[PDB]
Design a protein around this ligand. Structure first.
Ligand SMILES: O=S(=O)(NCc1ccc(S(=O)(=O)c2ccc(O)c(O)c2)cc1)c1cc(O)c(O)cc1-c1ccc(O)cc1
Ligand SMILES: O=S(=O)(NCc1ccc(S(=O)(=O)c2ccc(O)c(O)c2)cc1)c1cc(O)c(O)cc1-c1ccc(O)cc1
Ligand SMILES: O=P(O)(O)OC[C@H]1O[C@](O)(COP(=O)(O)O)[C@@H](O)[C@@H]1O
Ligand SMILES: O=P(O)(O)OC[C@H]1O[C@](O)(COP(=O)(O)O)[C@@H](O)[C@@H]1O
Ligand SMILES: O=P(O)(O)OC[C@H]1O[C@](O)(COP(=O)(O)O)[C@@H](O)[C@@H]1O
Ligand SMILES: O=P(O)(O)OC[C@H]1O[C@](O)(COP(=O)(O)O)[C@@H](O)[C@@H]1O
Ligand SMILES: O=C([O-])C(=O)[O-]
Ligand SMILES: O=C([O-])C(=O)[O-]
Ligand SMILES: O=C([O-])C(=O)[O-]
Ligand SMILES: O=C([O-])C(=O)[O-]
Ligand SMILES: [K+]
Ligand SMILES: [K+]
Ligand SMILES: [K+]
Ligand SMILES: [K+]
Ligand SMILES: [Mg+2]
Ligand SMILES: [Mg+2]
Ligand SMILES: [Mg+2]
Ligand SMILES: [Mg+2]
Lengths: 436, 425, 422, 425
């Protein structure tokens, strides 16, 4: 009790009963489980991003506005079906729906566009259709590529080459779908930006009863590497026809979040199903409950112990900031980022505090949805003459936007992460600020 | 040998952190141990045939559930007769005979405040037909359990009562319910309609953790392989759900419509068997055993003291099994609560105890039918030899394996106090 | 080569047993000695020439035992210590602040005695930094010492000496109102059974470490060195184990006050302390200290834990902190970082007093204030870095953690920065 | 059942702590030790401690092993010292409460490029006079131990060789020396002159840790209570040194000049006894047992498997003792390696094994001299009851207490494989 007594007196007992905080303070994993409480309500914003596949059930601008409101963060275009003309219209409709909320900069939500490739088929590597589809992706400014049937490091090098010199900023998420991809996982992860556990094909390529082992291992290795991992396929399958999911489906979504997935996905549930918006709402509801049930006490200790020593100041600042956020139960960590990297390094330590990422890059704002707990804020104001004033204005934008979006209140403590000079790669400062 | 240490997720078992444990899980590391989590299959039109019941026993069914929400007493008496005929068709080979428990699942209170009149009549039918277990529907408080116990009468004192937690009140009054029950069922069907669907996993994980702390059986139930009612293969969420219920700590997993009315009852049992075996090997025993030991209170009961010593000894030598003699099942239950990797082979003369111990994870019951030897120590040795010979035939044991043998100092229940390290010859 | 020094193989061990098995007599210490040495001043160590050698040997705090000697005798001891200290001020690098501590005679058969009231008044008038209060039995004893120091002695640190059964039993209430504790083993070993003193020592050190308050281990640590040039095997073991237990300071009494080898006794404590500090099992220690320290909304407390976590992540050579009272350095010290805590301060008294906290290396800044406050902060940080390089704490390519505040005055530390040296 | 008073004694609040920091914070000077002193005391015999009357007082004060320093004195002088020790020990044979075996250890003069001529002759004298242990001076490599072993002739292969590590080479070649030795002595006198004085604590803690990991006895020696050669009370550093050697994990602690030539030999023994008892209660068994368990490799040796099961069982019930039957002392040594809080009462027919087991922390030997029963199980039961009755007489046991009993399945050394939980009647 002494470790939380003064803060319980200051913040109140009501604060410490919410968001599974009694289970979070437990000394063992067994006690953590025993203290999980269905009456302990989640308070934090939902941190695991939702990827929704766009199809006939979710293609209209009106339907896409409801999906964005329900929680969709990434729109997936499955290039296994449909023409380039069909996908270009889907992209235009997503952008029209997203930009319909841009009139209010303090609330606008960026939505990433991901292109999922058809795959190699019977071939040994990059197919001719994939080369044409990847060129379409670059020409239409997609943010992410979900590369199908990645079996080795040379497969991701071929995808990177097909994106050309103009597609250097596109994130490549390698889909692991067969035995070879699982066995060569380390070499694939090393050259990829992240991984997708593509359970549909994986469950037919390897015994169905072994898929959970591959999922848990790949999520663990991605968490260790600090790279995004997506759990995909049949998560809420019965909602293609029914308005409510099965008990196994809610369990599956909760367990993917507890395992450590940065993103969760919907395929037929949103592409062709009867209830696309309800499927997004269900993933949102479960993910929020599961995030609060994470046992941060052991998780943070293990992430620190396993993460190798680092001389990179962004990495050093990130661990200091996450430690500081846990010490004061900070509502948020506000970070300035150009590429998203400083926010990704905070996310890898799995803070309970929201990572509010302020950026001028529209593409980085879309791409950071791949990292658990990163909430992108697109800053549109022109630069101040004095760089230090421009930094301060962006920090104040994060604080004000946070206070006007549900994140912060007067008296809260916030951790602020910034750098010593302009340009990417120089994050080195952590500050503790009291919200006024 | 190096081959031994590559199987049953042993590289992941030796990891220093849970994160490293996850990183070392290997799809090529094959399970070797017998499947420890019992399978409960609900009986119905798809699984009432005596021939179909034989295939379900072979597939891995350990407990047959009779759902009294449907069907008359005459229907349920025929289901019981059919199950017993199928089970006893294998009695001619005592070394491979598999006991199968019969569980009666009550209709419930309905709109009433407590034990309904139909439940009183159904519980009396259960006692008259010798059922082993009662799955009591909609248990909301300790007095509900007392009412079930009273309705079983003086002849049903040995029947196990597993309380079904199906609503908010049952979750909130969980501790008082568990204290007077033999175990719990996380009845997710009704629970998922009584409380928000997105909160069921919290109730499941909490109840399994509390049952594991108490050393009492816990069952995970409903929609685990739902799509297999009409499809030959389950969804990715369904295999994940079964694996995660085992990893959470469930002693039993259940099939309802999948075996009672579906077109793939045998395949649904085979699928639960396959997933449970993989998940049991992926349990992180290093932290689990440390936490169970630390949370279990100090005890002056010799059965409890012997049980923790035997589990510790089994881990030290990678014992293939812990062979235990038991009259009521209690000595096997106390070994099971520490979650040994070694199979707990329980030798008993009680047909009812042999059926009931399927409620405890990792207990493999063997029904001993031979009349007693005149010298008690020789009778004890003959039962231990029966455990060994049954284990060899079934694949649990081989020549050269080490086993831990748990027995007592006098006949009768309650006197377990001896642990012995034995080499299989 | 880096990973073979300072017991780093033993530091990376997964269990305390493996940590012990990996301790290596060939693994040389590299870090600066963190546990301060308190030397009692007497006839063997009173001359200016002897005091210069004691400062060079490692003495950080000079103890004046008011159980013997007149006020005139102690005033001369103080003047000699200050003269020896300022003789190195010509070349600040060898300049090291030395605290002056007054150890009271005690209550005797009486609370606060009349002689103690007069001696505490003398302490305030002569600007002593610390009071070692004898025979503290309860919180009201500390309040009486505080009252006797008056309004001019508010800044003096009170270290309560626990010397009997009552002091041990009422430890929590005494620690709550004290700045720190001294395990006064001489009287403790006669007041309670001799075989129980180690229990009282280990308990008091553990509770002081939990509270983040300084604790001193004292008496008969190197006793045989009063007449012999080398200590016994039990004496070297005792010094090493006091450091391993968690003592912030170790002390010499007769060994330096009247013995034949005062300088050698200081050199021996320095040598043992450096070896013992490298043998600390930081892997479990940091985890336990980090878990036990309560959650806090105080920005200095929040910044301190963030800075120590950052230092461990990059094997930082030092944490440079700006401090007025020493508090920001004390909050970093409580987490027992392997990185040296280099404390830059303008307060000469704070520079002397921070020797009470393990691993705090004070640097006295004496330059005029810059017109722009941000530039004055930058100049002090640069002074910490350049002094760190000159003194051997830092080298090109090292990473340092820098801890500062958002406005002038004590209590506003809230910033941690990661900096690469040259 | 036990009472709140029981849980306030022997540092039990500090023993139940979840962290080492909380363990330290809970150490209490008012919590009195209750268990018998487990760390043996080795006293060096000389002019101050040679008379039969003085030796009787030293045995009463707690001396378990008598050390003969062959660096000084003739064979005739040492033979008379041995005769005086045996006469003093046998003067207590009339009382089963006061009788205690005392081991005799020969400490060699030392090396020269091989074993010295004087050491060959002194080792021969040791075999001829039936010494139990050799403390071999200046052991630098495994071949030095082989030379000592060869010098123990055809008759002294059962004598224990404790290698003294006294220089840099001995520390660097520690692993190869420990592998071939029965145990180690941290000989701090010479070690503190051969290596820098400020590094001796590192060598001590490393060697104690490695011996504890190997399950072999380790002795801490020299200048532990040095000032007591001329003063009636020790310094604060000296009491701290003795307490810290016990906390480090030393099986034995030693007195040299303090008992051989000092003015207070009996008081020095009394002081080591008093400090050792306090320090043993302050051991943090919770983390120590977990680490010893985790570091000890997996084993298929039934004696090793039984030992860890017995120690686990003893902790579960706060057992008053673990009674073990042993012929060579090995089964008692394997229980001792896991550092149980319970006393290990070792019943043996070997007078030599009874003296030698004083090298292992917490082993209390009982020499059994009854003629063997014709029925082996009756002979085993008689010895188990002999251990219980001796435990009652000595104050370890009372009616209602639980004890753990360790035996084997057949006669002869090497077959330990049984652990039983017994209630004292
Ligand atoms: O800290 S964690 O949340 N949990 C660590 C943890 C510790 C012990 C065990 S046990 O020994 O098998 C076990 C199981 C049930 C018992 O009743 C019990 O006593 C012990 C299982 C997990 C975490 C840590 C990680 O490093 C990580 O990568 C991910 C996660 C995690 C992964 C999966 C989740 O379902 C939730 C979180
Ligand atoms: O992390 S620590 O450095 N050491 C933690 C530690 C862990 C276990 C044990 S044990 O279970 O008794 C033990 C003893 C010997 C064995 O062979 C073995 O396997 C286990 C002893 C220490 C530390 C932690 C603290 O929180 C603290 O306040 C202080 C210290 C400490 C204090 C005194 C020291 O001698 C060194 C450090
Ligand atoms: O996360 P990234 O991509 O490294 O960006 C972090 C960068 O953002 C900043 O905080 C502000 O930089 P800009 O003013 O160029 O936007 C830098 O100081 C820091 O290097
Ligand atoms: O697990 P339970 O019901 O306590 O049964 C254990 C009992 O079984 C035995 O091993 C054998 O007893 P029986 O010969 O009566 O079958 C007893 O020694 C022991 O008390
Ligand atoms: O450790 P303390 O006593 O709180 O002092 C820390 C203070 O030192 C500073 O870094 C510098 O303050 P000054 O300019 O007044 O010396 C402040 O920003 C901070 O509040
Ligand atoms: O410790 P040791 O020397 O192996 O002796 C243990 C032996 O003692 C016994 O318990 C009793 O044997 P004995 O009857 O020959 O004395 C054996 O069963 C066991 O093998
Ligand atoms: O491609 C996919 O998403 C799959 O197979 O799951
Ligand atoms: O009753 C049940 O089995 C349920 O509701 O899950
Ligand atoms: O007063 C003291 O310093 C003592 O008793 O140790
Ligand atoms: O020989 C010894 O005992 C020593 O040197 O300490
Ligand atoms: K595709
Ligand atoms: K029912
Ligand atoms: K004094
Ligand atoms: K000698
Ligand atoms: Mg696919
Ligand atoms: Mg129901
Ligand atoms: Mg005193
Ligand atoms: Mg010597």
């Amino acid at each position: 009790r002494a470790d939380v007594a003064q803060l319980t007196q200051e913040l109140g007992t009501a604060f410490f009963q919410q968001q599974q905080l009694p289970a979070a303070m437990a000394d063992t994993f067994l006690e953590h489980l025993c203290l999980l409480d269905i009456d302990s309500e989640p308070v934090a914003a939902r941190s695991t991003s939702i990827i929704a596949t766009i199809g006939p059930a979710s293609r209209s601008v009106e339907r896409l506005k409801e999906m964005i409101k329900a929680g969709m963060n990434i729109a997936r275009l499955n290039f296994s079906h449909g023409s380039h003309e069909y996908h270009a219209e889907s992209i235009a409709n997503v952008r029209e729906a997203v930009e319909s909320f841009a009139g209010s900069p303090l609330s606008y939500r960026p939505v990433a566009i991901a292109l999922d490739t058809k795959g190699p088929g019977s071939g040994p590597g990059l197919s001719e259709q994939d080369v044409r589809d990847l060129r379409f992706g670059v020409e239409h400014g997609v943010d992410i590529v979900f590369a199908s049937f990645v079996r080795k490091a040379s497969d991701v090098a071929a995808v990177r080459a097909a994106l050309g010199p103009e597609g250097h900023g596109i994130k490549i998420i390698s889909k692991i779908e067969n035995h070879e991809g699982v066995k060569r996982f380390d070499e694939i992860l090393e050259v990829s930006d992240g991984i997708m556990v593509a359970r549909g094909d994986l469950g037919i390529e390897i015994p169905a009863e072994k898929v959970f082992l591959a999922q848990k291992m790949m999520i663990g290795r991605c968490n260790l590497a600090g790279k995004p991992v997506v759990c995909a396929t049949q998560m809420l399958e019965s909602m293609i026809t029914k308005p409510r999911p099965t008990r196994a489906e809610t369990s599956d979504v909760a367990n993917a979040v507890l395992d450590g997935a940065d993103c969760i996905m919907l395929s037929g549930e949103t592409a062709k199903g009867n209830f696309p918006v309800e499927a997004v709402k269900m993933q949102h509801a479960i993910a929020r409950e599961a995030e609060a049930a994470v046992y941060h006490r052991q998780l943070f200790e293990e992430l620190r112990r396993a993460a190798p020593l680092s001389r990179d100041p962004t990495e050093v600042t990130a661990i200091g900031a996450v430690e500081a956020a846990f010490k004061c139960c900070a509502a948020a960590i506000i970070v300035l980022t150009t590429t998203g990297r400083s926010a990704q390094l905070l996310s890898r330590y799995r803070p309970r505090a929201a990572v509010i990422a302020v950026t001028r890059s529209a593409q980085a704002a879309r791409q950071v949805h791949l990292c658990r707990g990163v909430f992108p804020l697109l800053y549109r104001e022109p630069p101040e003459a004095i760089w230090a004033d421009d930094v301060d204005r962006r920090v104040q934008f994060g604080i004000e936007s946070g206070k006007l979006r549900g994140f912060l209140r007067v008296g809260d403590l916030v951790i602020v992460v910034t750098g010593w000079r302009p340009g990417s790669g120089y994050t080195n400062i952590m500050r503790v600020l009291s919200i006024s």
